[PDB]
């Protein structure tokens, strides 16, 4: 038999299982862990959940090629993706790992729910600390970013927007001499040019005000 085993990097590798009905200890031993280490073993269910495998919990491998996350750790943190609970043996999780676990398509935007301010957008390489109190909740939305042009909010479909295209979409003639200054939240306004590129992924809604 064969199984696929990965770690916090989620890079699966083939492992040979000589028993069709192993328990957590056998899966841990086949993955290269001594009995005293007791790694955390998480079986990837077909629906999308992760089932914790005890050292004496027999797993039926005759079904199909099952996948496991075997990470030497002494704890597990619970988080959620769209209300579905998931388990993670490490306290720091990257956005890429969240997308891998939740099977979120790359055409969507990942957010971390907050109550005291706007929900935080999580990039691929951004690290979220799960050790914070409470269950961290993640959300998938449509990949659209808002921009406040002349006091009106327009919803672009790209993380980065050319200022000329933004003005064109707003309706103003880009060819006129404009004093363009951007006002990112929490930062002073910075003058820009008609042909510059604005990254909307910064937290909050940017304000692209124009004057003649
Ligand atoms: Ca057995
Ligand atoms: Ca179990
Ligand atoms: Ca919120
Ligand atoms: Ca937490
Ligand atoms: Ca923004």
């Amino acid at each position: 038999r064969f199984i696929e085993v990965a770690d916090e990097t989620l890079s699966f590798r083939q492992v040979v299982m000589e028993d069709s009905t192993p328990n957590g200890s056998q899966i841990s031993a086949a993955s290269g862990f001594k009995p005293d280490q007791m790694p955390v073993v998480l079986m990837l269910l077909p629906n999308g959940s992760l089932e914790d495998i005890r050292p004496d919990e027999v797993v039926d491998l005759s079904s199909e090629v099952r996948r496991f996350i075997v990470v030497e750790s002494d704890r597990t943190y619970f988080f959620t993706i769209d209300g579905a609970r998931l388990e993670w043996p490490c306290r720091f999780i990257t956005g890429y790992s969240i997308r891998q676990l939740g099977d979120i398509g790359d055409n969507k935007k990942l957010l971390l729910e907050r109550e005291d301010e706007a929900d935080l957008e999580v990039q691929n390489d951004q690290i979220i600390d799960l050790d914070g109190d409470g269950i961290e909740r993640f959300i998938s939305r449509k990949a659209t970013w808002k921009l406040n042009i002349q006091g009106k909010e327009f919803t672009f479909d790209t993380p980065t927007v050319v200022i000329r295209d933004a003005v064109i979409r707003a309706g103003l003639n880009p060819n006129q001499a404009w004093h363009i200054f951007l006002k990112v939240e929490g930062q002073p306004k910075v003058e820009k040019n008609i042909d510059d590129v604005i990254d909307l992924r910064t937290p909050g809604i940017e304000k692209l005000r124009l004057t003649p």
Side-chain angles (χ1 to χ4, degrees), residues 93-113:
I93 183 168
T94 56
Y96 183 84
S97 302
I98 301 171
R99 290 181 175 271
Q100 287 293 304
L101 288 180
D103 198 71
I104 299 181
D106 55 74
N107 75 278
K108 311 189 73 58
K109 168 208 295 182
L110 188 63
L111 300 172
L112 170 68
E113 288 198 32

Side-chain angles (χ1 to χ4, degrees), residues 113-115 117 119:
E113 288 198 32
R114 293 174 171 177
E115 299 174 345
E117 56 182 8
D119 297 8

Side-chain angles (χ1 to χ4, degrees), residues 51-54 57:
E51 181 66 32
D52 201 329
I53 303 296
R54 305 185 315 268
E57 180 174 3

